[PDB]
């Protein structure tokens, strides 16, 4: 336990391709946009940029969470590590 | 000397024309 996970880490760090599925993400974005103005249109590049920014943000957040979890002498990331990371970043 | 700092020296000290007319009036009087 812990070898295929490292192999997948290595694999996914060698690559750049987006990890969240494109159409579920589109539907999520439309659902969220449905509150601020009814029946909006979106460019495809807008959704692509949103997905790139979201994945970059989440990867940075997982980096900070991993740092905190290692600090606690652990290897498992827990929600309180996320909360501490978002607190120190200054996130609300 | 060198031209640019010669221009700077002119800027700092002037060619005298700012008071050449004053000097001319002094010599006239």
């Amino acid at each position: 336990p812990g070898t295929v996970a490292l192999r997948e880490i290595r694999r996914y760090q060698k690559s750049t391709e987006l990890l969240i599925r494109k159409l579920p993400f589109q539907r999520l974005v439309r659902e969220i946009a449905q509150d601020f103005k009814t029946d909006l249109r979106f460019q495809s590049a807008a959704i692509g940029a949103l997905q790139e920014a979201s994945e970059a943000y989440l990867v940075g957040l997982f980096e900070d969470t991993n740092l905190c979890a290692i600090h606690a002498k652990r290897v498992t990331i827990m929600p309180k590590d996320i909360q501490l990371a978002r607190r120190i970043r200054g996130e609300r | 000397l060198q031209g640019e700092q010669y221009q700077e020296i002119i800027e700092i000290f002037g060619d005298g024309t700012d008071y050449q007319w004053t000097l001319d009036a002094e010599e006239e009087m």
């Binding site: - | 700092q5 700077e8 700092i12 002037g14 700012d18």
Partner: protein, 139 residues
């Protein structure tokens, strides 16, 4: 401390400019220049204070110094006390090329050097100061 000195020096600058304008008008109105003489003691006391030199250079009071040293349009030189005090103050302060560029006092210094109604001692001091100010430019 030092923001306050800059404000006081700016007030002195305004007073000096106003006094120069008033004296010029009085001479144009047929009256002697007295306001410069009245303001001379305070200007002398301020200039003699060494620690205020930095604030003086930060407010460019040398512009008003040159304005006072500039001969009036009637071709009449300023009072000898004013010239002597201003020359002593110029000697007493570390004038650099940037300050001369801001003030442009070199033109008036050259005029004083070339003029003959100026006191010969003031002529020698003007030559010395001009040479000292040309020293950093050439090396």
């Amino acid at each position: 401390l030092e923001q306050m000195q800059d404000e006081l020096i700016q007030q002195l600058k305004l007073q000096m400019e106003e006094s120069a304008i008033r004296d010029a008008n009085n001479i144009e109105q047929g009256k002697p220049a007295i306001f410069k003489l009245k303001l001379l003691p305070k200007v002398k006391d301020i200039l003699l204070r060494a620690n205020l030199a930095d604030s003086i250079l930060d407010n460019n009071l040398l512009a008003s110094v040159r304005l006072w040293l500039e001969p009036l349009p009637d071709a009449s030189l300023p009072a000898y006390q004013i010239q002597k005090v201003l020359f002593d103050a110029i000697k007493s302060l570390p004038i650099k090329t940037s300050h001369l560029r801001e003030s442009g006092l070199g033109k008036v210094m050259v005029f004083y050097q070339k003029s003959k109604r100026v006191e010969p001692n003031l002529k020698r001091t003007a030559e010395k100061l001009i040479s000292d100010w040309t020293r950093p430019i050439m090396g």
